[PDB]
Design a protein around this nucleic acid. Sequence first.
RNA 1: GGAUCACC
RNA 2: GGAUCACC
RNA 3: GGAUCACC
RNA 4: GGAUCACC
Lengths: 129, 129, 129, 129, 129, 129
Amino acid sequence: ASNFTQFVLVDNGGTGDVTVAPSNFANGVAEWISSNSRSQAYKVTCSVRQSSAQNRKYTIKVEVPKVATQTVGGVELPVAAWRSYLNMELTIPIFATNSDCELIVKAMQGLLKDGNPIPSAIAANSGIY
Amino acid sequence: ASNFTQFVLVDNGGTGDVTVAPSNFANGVAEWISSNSRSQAYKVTCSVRQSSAQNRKYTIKVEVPKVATQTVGGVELPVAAWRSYLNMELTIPIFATNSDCELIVKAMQGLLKDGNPIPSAIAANSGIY
Amino acid sequence: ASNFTQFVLVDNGGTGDVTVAPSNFANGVAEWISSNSRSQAYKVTCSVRQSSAQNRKYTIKVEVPKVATQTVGGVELPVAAWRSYLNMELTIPIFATNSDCELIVKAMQGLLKDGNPIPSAIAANSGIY
Amino acid sequence: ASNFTQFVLVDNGGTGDVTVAPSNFANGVAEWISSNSRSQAYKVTCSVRQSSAQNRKYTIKVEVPKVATQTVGGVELPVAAWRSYLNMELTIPIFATNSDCELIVKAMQGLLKDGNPIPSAIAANSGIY
Amino acid sequence: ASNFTQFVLVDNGGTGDVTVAPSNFANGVAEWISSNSRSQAYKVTCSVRQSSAQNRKYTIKVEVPKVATQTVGGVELPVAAWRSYLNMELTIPIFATNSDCELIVKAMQGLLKDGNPIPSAIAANSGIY
Amino acid sequence: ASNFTQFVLVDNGGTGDVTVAPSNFANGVAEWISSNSRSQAYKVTCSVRQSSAQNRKYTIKVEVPKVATQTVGGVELPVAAWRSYLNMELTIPIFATNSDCELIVKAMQGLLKDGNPIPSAIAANSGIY
RNA sequence: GGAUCACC
RNA sequence: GGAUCACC
RNA sequence: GGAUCACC
RNA sequence: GGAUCACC
């Protein structure tokens, strides 16, 4: 194995899927960027550290760009009009079994499943009510 | 709509699924917890607010219990040995349309989809290699 | 080659052997862990660097769990009562050829071979007498 | 018994084996040197101490010399062109059974077995990748 | 997936090829060293950093040794009589798409292609004329 | 005889090839520029000097432009939206025979050969991982 | 807390 | 700029 | 961390 | 070290 592989970040149903691929592991921060100019690329980073004697902490960041073409000095440059940033930190005790861990993964997957409260709020520029 | 409803957090395939239900709404912060003692419950909370003039930020927090060797209803100390804490912060610029937001949700669903690098590392008590 | 692969750490003769597999590579430090919670796992890490102008140094670290009376997946405290820590540092002058290095490995295999003074003392909770 | 016996440090297959024999136990540091001039001898030292109220710590050092004959002042002297130093410290809790200890020994033996990642890297002047 | 693997630095037909293998990835500086004595080995290092707001900057270094034996007072050591040091810094704006980077790469390969002015001047201890 | 001639810097099959032609050899600095507007042209410079008593030092520089049109107030000019700058310095002791220099050259060609770590990282807007 | 996001 | 080459 | 390796 | 790249 090697879990450092590419994957589809945005599954747009076979066409216009956004796949992100490995691009750097300097300083122990695993990085993946979409196949774009670095100014318009999607980026995902992940790093794990023993945040304490008894915890391990994963730090995952995702940047979703809104691409544009800005005219600077009379010249057109590929640019990102804005960026949406996701920052997540997961602290897991060292006493967690592989099954305990799989439980955390499933909880995170269910949280964002289509139709559930949270992804429905975000997608509608609303809050939970 | 009205999205503060009960949902399935851990899908164990119809049998032994973990449902989380509304439990508090003080301060506009929606809270959902599982049917357990608060020390052993699955807890999810979510709130939105405008972090700055240019952004809106969602703060989602999840607590997952260490289930292996757990004594249901018992007093388990130290608390930090028996719980995992997830903390997500999603920053979205005020220009993001509903469409932009749906894509942001897709990017999040993709990152955690089964079989991708990140969920596989977490689930296997691993980092990236 | 490509040597960051899974291997058998504890050979219990084909049955109940302990295999340790790649789990992290942040900072060029290869890590291998067994299939357990991180508190009960067998862990091995290895890195090389040039310690000085004249030497290269390998830093190998191993953690072995106290298995007698262990509760698989349980929370066992204090951590220091349930784990043994091995720490090896191998310093090799830049003049050592591959041949010189093979002999150095043989010297290490010899020291720990079954039946010699050192492994026998360790295994019997003894010193030298 | 008396585990303070001689042993073959480098098994060169019956011919040119490097056997190391007991040579000193002053100050509680057990020593073994190869049958050479003290300037060209292989040396192994071992000492155990109750590093703490609840630990015991073994300190093992091995020196592998690269022998030469240096001409000092117009005279030839048996000398070591350089030395490779191995330093290992093993900390074992006092709660470790003899079987727990045997497990540590096997882990150390498997680590260095021919063909496994670590001894393969060292022997090839390479790192783990 | 990884690009931190071994590769043929010098292709001398299929035999007498110089293969450089990964050795250390400390502080975002990837290092590859050829086998045998570290003293006579080839070395390649590479690192990338964001040199400024719009630029990323690669720093590649290569050392080619002149393999020789040093005899001093009758003790001979494997040394490098001397070394050539190559230091290249490639600056690339963040507006470069992957297509642009492939072009930057073909330009570098062309500069050094056999028969072109530059590699011919170097191979002949000459300058431009 | 001269090595100050034109050459294909970028080989795009046999068409869309970038040819750089001699332009100026002032002060021991050879310069080659591609055709058309000097503003959108490629540039290669090379010079050799005796950096020290035992060394000679080559300084090669290459600029790859991003061809674009600048419109300002209705007046459009042929410009380069931006440029990548390559700066390489090759140091070679005066003891190097022609054979040694040919080896230094094959090492440079190999570093950048297609598929090897370095040219692959660059062509993909990536680092080492 | 916050960001322009491995940063303050 | 120079190096003994991730230093100066 | 480091060594010339029971040392700093 | 940085560059707008034989400059700083």
